Nucleic acid binder design. Structure first.
Ligand SMILES: [Mg+2]
Ligand SMILES: [Mg+2]
Ligand SMILES: [Mg+2]
Ligand SMILES: [Mg+2]
Ligand SMILES: [Mg+2]
Ligand SMILES: [Mg+2]
Ligand SMILES: [Mg+2]
Ligand SMILES: [Mg+2]
Ligand SMILES: [Mg+2]
Ligand SMILES: [Mg+2]
Ligand SMILES: [Mg+2]
Ligand SMILES: [Mg+2]
Ligand SMILES: [Mg+2]
Ligand SMILES: [Mg+2]
Ligand SMILES: [Mg+2]
Ligand SMILES: [Mg+2]
Ligand SMILES: [Mg+2]
Ligand SMILES: [Mg+2]
Ligand SMILES: [Mg+2]
Ligand SMILES: [Mg+2]
Ligand SMILES: [Mg+2]
Ligand SMILES: [Mg+2]
Ligand SMILES: [Mg+2]
Ligand SMILES: [Mg+2]
Ligand SMILES: [Mg+2]
Ligand SMILES: [Mg+2]
Lengths: 125, 123, 205, 82, 130
RNA sequence: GAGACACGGUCCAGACUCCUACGGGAGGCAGCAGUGGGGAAUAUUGCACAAUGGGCGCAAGCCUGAUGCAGCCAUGCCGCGUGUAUGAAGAAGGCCUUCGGGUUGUAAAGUACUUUCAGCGGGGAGGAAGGGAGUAAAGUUAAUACCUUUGCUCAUUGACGUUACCCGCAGAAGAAGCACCGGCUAACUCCGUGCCAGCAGCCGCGGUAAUACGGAGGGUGCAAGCGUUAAUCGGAAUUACUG
């Protein structure tokens, strides 16, 4: 199982777009407003951040990342790239979990659990 | 001086011998390391300079310098020498090319890598 | 083939303003124009005779944005042409297409005008030209093609050009977005802070 | 014999021809006797694509020189157009 | 549309001592292996790479060494595996010198390597892993 | 043989390689490719006679590794690209610090734009002149045949080639390294090290505060290249004719 996740940080929060074999499979949103890369990557690394920034209607900022999750036989990995996926270059953030997953729904559960409490339930198309 | 003297004997030039005669106007030469050892420089320097004796493909047997820190050269190693004498070692006129043939590049070299055969550190 | 680094750093080193930014703000408002770049920027050592000619050559090379090989070829061409070699070199640099586009007004900077020329938005005598080093000739009409007349940055660059000084050897029409290169600029038409004798001397060492 | 043929002197994909009077045993771009004009096949308009010295050509034909096929076609052009 | 799948970059060096494979993963040297394949000529090298075998190896000549380098890129697309081999460097908008493909699907890099190793069956020693 | 004492002719001898029934025979890449070897080191056993040229032929045509092109290689020269404008919380982190700050630095981000080239799709010059079929007239001739000459018609002739070039599409995406920073010589500090390890074109540096060694931050010079080595002239008026 593989998922490609387009992640957009903006002043309104964090938008997750979930792709599956190149098809948009699910969407969700989180109230995570974090302008700086350091705060974004710290959130991405830690799965949480203590204090969110304040939403600004006047100024709209958009910062995009892509997480790619792969269910290898004895681990799951999630690499998130700034702007776009480049496989010959190194990942900006590296994460690994010692778990076996049967399907994409469990793989989402891992994703959901690292960012526990933030994302609403999936709207599926 | 006088032009009659010049008509009988023109002015002659200086046939300039090269300092690297065992290259025979080649940029590099290949040779096998007959012996690898260390020598002491001449005054006012003090060190143990790393040096080897090399038999070239043209039959010359010359002494070559090994620049950089650490090397993997043994007897029967096939190296490439380039030219350029070490000022303070008596009779050493050639430099071993690091990174070519048997000779490996220096370790942990981050600056002037291409002068020591070190690949760019990917990251 | 181009310089793709910080632009004000190149003018802090040269001490003066190279007009590498559009001029909306004062250059002093964006950098320390009086201080050279780097950690040891406050220190101002003495400059040798070699380093004075070099800095003068780097200044002109950076105003027009020309690398060393192509700039050395300008000197040979300027030295072969009849007349003042130091003035033939500034006339060759002023006849470049990406410089004519900037002086007319269609570009905010010379790097922006260079992108306009290379993206096939400029036509010389009714033909689309694509080379920034293309030499323009007297009585040549260079205009912006119809597909690009709608670009907002072309209009923004025309009002900035009003704040600058008008070049006399050109005649631009801000309505039709066309201009006429009528003659090569004399040395008096150019800046006076450029000492081109230093450049000629540097290329005879 | 002595011929009047074409020698290929241009660049790649942009040929340019010199009309020369040469001994036939020589190489095409090699030794010749006289140059009597040029032919530019990819010439632009308002440009002289062909120019032939018809007086020296008639001088060599009188002495027994043969004409190449492509040059025999150029002479008909330099005359019919004129 | 993205085409990001499992990928392996394999630097292959033929030399007088044999054939060295260095496997890179996100630009990180992930694994090493070696094969006793001594083939000096470019023609014989390309024939071996395409066919997966060669009948007669050249002689080892320690006094006259050489080094000839290629890069294989393996991609595990959803329905098929591809390998493209370039002489000395990746030129992706120009065609591969050697191009091989397999219908089977492997999900992970370990399955991808298995395809590579099975094509060159019997030649490469077991992986030294880092 | 007009022409050779003949690259892919003959004869003899010699060395080498091969075939043999052992008696005897065959061969010559310094043609184009290619192989082995030598070397620091130099490419594909590609396509086509479409063009130019050559041989033979009345011609059609046949032949042509000449030639025209294609492949490989940063080997050189030349052009272009790797974005443009904005942007001070002068962010974070790095480095330095007289602990005040400084610098990296408008640089990044963020914002607003552009799409050369590469990628995808569509269109599309020129290199082609001839030749062949027809007729018409003229020319000669007994002949309004035949032939030749000159016009006019009708079918065609491209290896390169998925040509150059042009239009459309999406998206800043697919695209920066190398040497140097004691003086000469453009560019300076911290740390590691301790006459060791090392550097070096020359002068020289290193024995505890190294701008010279090694790493880092900053900088300078070149740039799809950059360094090193070899080689020649220069500077060298240091063979001086000029001098
Ligand atoms: Mg260095
Ligand atoms: Mg260039
Ligand atoms: Mg002059
Ligand atoms: Mg005869
Ligand atoms: Mg006879
Ligand atoms: Mg005879
Ligand atoms: Mg002879
Ligand atoms: Mg013959
Ligand atoms: Mg032969
Ligand atoms: Mg050959
Ligand atoms: Mg060989
Ligand atoms: Mg060899
Ligand atoms: Mg070959
Ligand atoms: Mg032909
Ligand atoms: Mg034949
Ligand atoms: Mg090239
Ligand atoms: Mg700070
Ligand atoms: Mg294109
Ligand atoms: Mg045509
Ligand atoms: Mg035509
Ligand atoms: Mg120095
Ligand atoms: Mg200095
Ligand atoms: Mg050094
Ligand atoms: Mg001391
Ligand atoms: Mg110290
Ligand atoms: Mg002299």
């Amino acid at each position: 199982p593989t998922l490609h996740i387009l992640l957009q940080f903006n002043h309104r929060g964090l938008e997750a777009r979930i792709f599956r074999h190149g098809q948009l499979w699910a969407e969700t949103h989180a109230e995570v407003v974090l302008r700086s890369k350091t705060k974004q990557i710290s959130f991405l690394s830690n799965g949480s951040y203590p204090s969110m920034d304040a939403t600004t209607p006047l100024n709209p900022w958009k910062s995009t990342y892509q997480a790619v999750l792969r269910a290898e036989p004895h681990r799951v990995t999630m690499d998130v790239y700034h702007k776009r996926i480049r496989p010959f270059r190194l990942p900006l953030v590296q994460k690994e979990w010692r778990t076996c997953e049967e399907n994409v729904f469990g793989l989402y559960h891992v994703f959901e659990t690292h960012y526990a409490g933030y994302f609403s339930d999936l709207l599926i198309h | 001086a006088t032009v009659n003297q010049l008509v009988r004997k023109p002015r002659a030039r200086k046939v300039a011998k090269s300092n690297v005669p065992a290259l025979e106007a080649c940029p590099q030469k290949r040779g096998v390391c007959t012996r690898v050892y260390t020598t002491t420089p001449k005054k006012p320097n003090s060190a143990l300079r790393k040096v080897c004796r090399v038999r070239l493909t043209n039959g010359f047997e010359v002494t070559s310098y090994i620049g950089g820190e650490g090397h993997n050269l043994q007897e029967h190693s096939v190296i490439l020498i380039r030219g350029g004498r070490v000022k303070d070692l008596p009779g050493v006129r050639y430099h071993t090319v690091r990174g070519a043939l048997d000779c490996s590049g220096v370790k942990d070299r981050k600056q002037a890598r291409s002068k020591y055969g070190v690949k760019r550190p990917k990251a | 083939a181009r310089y793709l680094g910080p632009k004000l750093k190149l003018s802090r080193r040269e001490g003066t303003d190279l007009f590498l930014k559009s001029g909306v703000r004062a250059i002093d408002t964006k950098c320390k124009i009086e201080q050279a770049p780097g950690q040891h920027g406050a220190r101002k050592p003495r400059l040798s005779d070699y380093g004075v000619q070099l800095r003068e050559k780097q200044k002109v090379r950076r105003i027009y944005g020309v690398l060393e090989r192509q700039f050395r070829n300008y000197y040979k061409e300027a030295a072969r042409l009849k007349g003042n070699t130091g003035e033939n070199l500034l006339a060759l640099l002023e006849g470049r297409l990406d410089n004519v586009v900037y002086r007319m007004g269609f570009g905010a900077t010379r790097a922006e005008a260079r992108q306009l020329v290379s993206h096939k938005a400029i036509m010389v005598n009714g033909r689309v030209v694509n080379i920034a080093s293309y030499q323009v000739s007297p009585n040549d009409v260079v205009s912006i093609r119809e597909k690009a007349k709608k670009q907002s940055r072309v209009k923004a660059a025309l009002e900035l050009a009003e704040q600058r000084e008008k070049p006399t050897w050109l005649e631009v029409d801000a309505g039709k977005m066309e201009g006429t290169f009528k003659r090569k600029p004399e040395r008096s038409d150019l800046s006076a802070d450029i000492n081109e004798h230093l450049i000629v001397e540097l290329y005879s060492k | 014999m002595v011929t009047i043929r074409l020698a290929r002197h241009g660049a790649k994909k942009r040929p340019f021809y010199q009309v020369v009077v040469a001994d036939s045993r020589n190489a095409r771009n090699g030794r010749f006797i006289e140059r009597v004009g040029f032919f530019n096949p990819i010439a632009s308009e308002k440009e002289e694509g062909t120019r032939l010295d018809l007086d020296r050509i008639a001088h060599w034909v009188g002495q027994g020189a043969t004409i190449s096929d492509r040059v025999a076609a150029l002479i008909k052009e330099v005359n019919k157009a004129a």
